[PDB]
């Protein structure tokens, strides 16, 4: 499971593939360093 | 589509507050660095 740190600010910076639909069909999820 | 080109790779960043429970939070999009 995933969980963050009650009430603290965070930044991801994810990078997407494009579906068909031209919506995002699978992301890498990372934290900004 | 129109949100992203199919099959193409793009980057997406968030900032984020994490809520009481520690596993939900409340973002908003960012530029990328």
């Known amino acids: ?3 963050c740190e009650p ?3 965070f ?3 994810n990078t997407c593939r494009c579906g068909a639909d031209g919506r ?3 992301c ?3 934290a900004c360093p």
Chains 1, 2 share one sequence.
């Open 1 to 3: 499971g995933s969980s």
């Open 24 to 26: 995002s069909a699978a």
């Open 7 to 9: 009430g603290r600010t």
């Open 11 to 13: 930044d991801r910076c």
């Open 28 to 30: 890498t999820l990372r």
